Amino acid sequence: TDRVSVGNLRIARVLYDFVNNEALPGTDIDPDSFWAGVDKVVADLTPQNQALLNARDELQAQIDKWHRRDMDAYRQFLTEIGYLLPEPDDFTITTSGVDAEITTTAGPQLVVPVLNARFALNAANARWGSLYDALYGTDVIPETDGAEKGPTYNKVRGDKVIAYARKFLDDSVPLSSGSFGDATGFTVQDGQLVVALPDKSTGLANPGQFAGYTGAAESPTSVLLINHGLHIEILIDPESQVGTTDRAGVKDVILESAITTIMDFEDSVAAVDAADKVLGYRNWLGLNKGDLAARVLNRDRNYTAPGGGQFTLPGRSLMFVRNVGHLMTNDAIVDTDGSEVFEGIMDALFTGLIAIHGLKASDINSRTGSIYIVKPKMHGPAEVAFTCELFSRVEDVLGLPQNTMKIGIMDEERRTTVNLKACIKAAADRVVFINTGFLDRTGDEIHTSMEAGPMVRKGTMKSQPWILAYEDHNVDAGLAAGFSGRAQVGKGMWTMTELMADMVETKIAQPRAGASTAWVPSPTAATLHALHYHQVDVAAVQQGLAGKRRATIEQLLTIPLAKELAWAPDEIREEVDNNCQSILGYVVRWVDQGVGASKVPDIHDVALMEDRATLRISSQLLANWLRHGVITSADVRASLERMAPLVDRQNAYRPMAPNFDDSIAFLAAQELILSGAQQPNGYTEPILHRRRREFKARAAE
Numbered sequence: 173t174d175r176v177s178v179g180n181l182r183i184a185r186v187l188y189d190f191v192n193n194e195a196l197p198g199t200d201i202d203p204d205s206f207w208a209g210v211d212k213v214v215a216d217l218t219p220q221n222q223a224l225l226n227a228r229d230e231l232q233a234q235i236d237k238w239h240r241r242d243m244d245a246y247r248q249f250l251t252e253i254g255y256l257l258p259e260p261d262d263f264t265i266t267t268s269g270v271d272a273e274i275t276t277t278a279g280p281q282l283v284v285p286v287l288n289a290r291f292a293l294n295a296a297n298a299r300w301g302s303l304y305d306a307l308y309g310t311d312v313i314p315e316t317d318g319a320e321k322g323p324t325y326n327k328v329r330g331d332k333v334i335a336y337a338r339k340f341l342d343d344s345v346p347l348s349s350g351s352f353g354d355a356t357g358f359t360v361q362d363g364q365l366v367v368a369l370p371d372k373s374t375g376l377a378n379p380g381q382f383a384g385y386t387g388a389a390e391s392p393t394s395v396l397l398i399n400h401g402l403h404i405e406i407l408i409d410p411e412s413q414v415g416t417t418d419r420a421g422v423k424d425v426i427l428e429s430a431i432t433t434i435m436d437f438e439d440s441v442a443a444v445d446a447a448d449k450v451l452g453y454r455n456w457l458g459l460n461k462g463d464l465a466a467r468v469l470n471r472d473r474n475y476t477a478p479g480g481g482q483f484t485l486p487g488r489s490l491m492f493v494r495n496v497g498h499l500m501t502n503d504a505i506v507d508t509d510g511s512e513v514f515e516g517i518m519d520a521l522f523t524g525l526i527a528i529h530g531l532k533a534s535d536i537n538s539r540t541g542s543i544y545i546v547k548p549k550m551h552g553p554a555e556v557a558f559t560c561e562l563f564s565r566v567e568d569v570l571g572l573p574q575n576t577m578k579i580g581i582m583d584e585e586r587r588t589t590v591n592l593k594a595c596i597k598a599a600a601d602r603v604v605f606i607n608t609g610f611l612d613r614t615g616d617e618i619h620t621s622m623e624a625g626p627m628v629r630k631g632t633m634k635s636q637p638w639i640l641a642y643e644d645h646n647v648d649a650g651l652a653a654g655f656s657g658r659a660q661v662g663k664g665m666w667t668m669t670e671l672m673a674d675m676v677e678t679k680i681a682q683p684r685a686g687a688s689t690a691w692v693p694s695p696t697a698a699t700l701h702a703l704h705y706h707q708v709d710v711a712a713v714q715q716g717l718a719g720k721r722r723a724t725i726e727q728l729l730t731i732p733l734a735k736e737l738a739w740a741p742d743e744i745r746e747e748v749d750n751n752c753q754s755i756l757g758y759v760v761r762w763v764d765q766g767v768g769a770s771k772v773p774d775i776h777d778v779a780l781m782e783d784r785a786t787l788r789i790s791s792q793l794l795a796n797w798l799r800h801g802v803i804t805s806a807d808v809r810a811s812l813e814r815m816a817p818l819v820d821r822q823n824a825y826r827p828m829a830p831n832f833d834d835s836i837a838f839l840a841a842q843e844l845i846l847s848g849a850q851q852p853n854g855y856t857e858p859i860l861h862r863r864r865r866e867f868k869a870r871a872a873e
């Protein structure tokens with residue numbers, strides 16, 4: 173083959189070479205030791221990896237049987253089989269060497285496919301983002317009559333943007349008197365910010381919010397403010413398009429936006445072989461070496477402190493990498509038997525290895541010496557413990573100090589949810605966040621209780637008692653584990669990329685709920701979501717939540733079973749079409765173009781940023797409805813066939829219709845549903861991976 177033999181492993185040459193030529197140089201890690209380490213770690217941890225996965229299946233089968241055959245009983249049952257484990261005594265996480273962006277700063281956290289270097293670079297650079305751009309460019313400023321986005325600058329719209337931002341300034345960094353809306357100028361005197369108004373001048377109600385400035389104190393080019401640990405920069409440039417129209421010559425308001433970014437190897441990317449992984453790893457590498465270029469990485473920002481000294485602010489989002497979970501294998505490395513190696517294990521090794529570059533001078537990431545790995549899709553504390561051991565073992569291979577590799581725990585599986593405290597405990601010295609991956613979580617919810625009855629509709633799930641309890645329980649567990657000031661308590665993604673007005677109105681709920689972070693899909697969204705952290709004092713919210721237990725185990729365990737006869741035929745139809753459309757729209761680009769996250773229009777034409785989890789939900793929901801006779805297989809087929817041409821229309825593209833059964837992507841979509849009930853925990857990867865690989869193969873001959 174085109175493989176490299178290393179002990180029991182046969183490493184894809186492309187990966188082998190990548191690692192030797194790109195990833196290893198500069199790390200002082202002995203290549204042979206590295207590779208011997210790979211082999212050893214893989215041999216050592218693979219069996220437990222498999223055991224854990226088997227354990228998921230065993231638990232699921234027992235739960236399946238339980239339904240096929242009442243809270244106290246169900247709970248008692250979950251406890252007997254070891255699904256529901258004892259909650260450990262209170263503890264405080266001890267995680268150290270974590271950067272301020274994670275321990276302290278509350279703000280947006282951007283998640284981006286690492287395979288898309290353009291996007292990844294944009295994300296890394298999204299630490300700072302133009303508020304005017306975010307406002308003008310999205311519907312946060314309604315495109316009502318006269319204020320629409322035109323081919324060119326609409327002054328009326330620009331004025332609304334300006335006014336929006338002035339109000340934001342007033343609300344975030346209040347003047348002692350008057351409104352920023354009436355500022356005619358900014359100056360710095362005696363290290364104090366002085367805002368010129370028509371009738372007089374004023375300072376900030378809290379001078380401490382004056383963070384700095386650029387240019388001459390007496391006609392600064394910008395003024396830097398801080399509020400809730402987040403920076404705001406008023407750019408002053410009368411001789412600019414927008415500045416010329418502005419009463420104080422203000423060109424823009426720049427917000428510190430994506431404080432952190434998750435470079436995603438998991439649900440937002442399609443990587444099914446060594447070539448894919450290598451592309452991912454190489455972007456991750458370029459990000460860490462600071463030399464990724466599509467466009468380049470921002471340098472730090474220079475400011476003059478209020479007193480006149482000089483200082484610097486991070487110009488880049490602090491990067492996490494999201495590794496894949498324990499489930500999938502990838503033929504990037506196979507053993508002598510030809511068995512694919514566990515991809516999670518590999519990610520730990522390679523992203524960890526690669527991350528070392530981000531810990532050192534770039535011809536840079538964590539100044540405190542941590543590598544931040546988000547671990548998705550874990551089920552329960554043993555799986556968390558396993559990830560920690562994996563990290564521990566990788567750290568050894570990489571010659572890294574123990575606990576350098578921090579873990580961002582996704583709480584997005586039910587068995588993690590109801591054992592969240594134990595999971596956090598398992599990673600007490602590595603955990604830098606917990607996050608409610610509510611989409612996967614819903615997928616898991618459905619699969620876990622697949623046999624219980626028909627589930628409520630997809631759109632209903634977001635408001636179901638289990639998920640609201642899950643959201644609160646997550647925050648409670650983090651806060652009780654001392655996350656406040658130590659680790660992020662994070663919440664899920666806003667997926668409606670075009671519904672920014674909506675995001676600004678509603679996503680504020682997450683910091684209000686004590687989330688020191690939440691996920692946005694884009695730099696723009698990060699900037700807008702930043703607004704929320706100016707309005708909400710997350711530190712205070714968290715302090716106020718301390719000691720609260722706002723969710724009971726019973727609530728967490730409240731299966732979202734649909735009430736008897738819940739839906740009219742048209743509602744069932746729409747739900748089926750809804751799900752088939754999103755499955756097809758997502759899958760076709762996954763399978764055909766190896767794109768793992770896309771703005772897929774939905775049934776109502778709303779642009780959703782679909783990642784794999786949305787696929788997990790839809791396919792599981794459909795599988796669940798099919799399982800319980802809500803819909804028939806013909807209903808599914810009809811909807812797939814009906815929705816397919818639309819998806820074909822909504823799209824370098826291979827149409828699915830009319831010859832559906834020649835379309836691997838169409839077959840994938842179908843398979844995802846018809847086999848949904850049999851996918852472990854409803855995971856879509858096995859099928860997506862197979863189908864994408866199949867497609868790649870046909871794309872060859």
Ligand SMILES: O=C(O)c1ccc2[nH]ccc2c1
Nearest residue numbers: 283439440665693769781783
């Ligand atoms: O992992 C997720 O929760 C998720 C969902 C949608 C997305 N769009 C871009 C990244 C991403 C991640």
Ligand SMILES: [Mg+2]
Nearest residue numbers: 584609612785
């Ligand atoms: Mg997820």
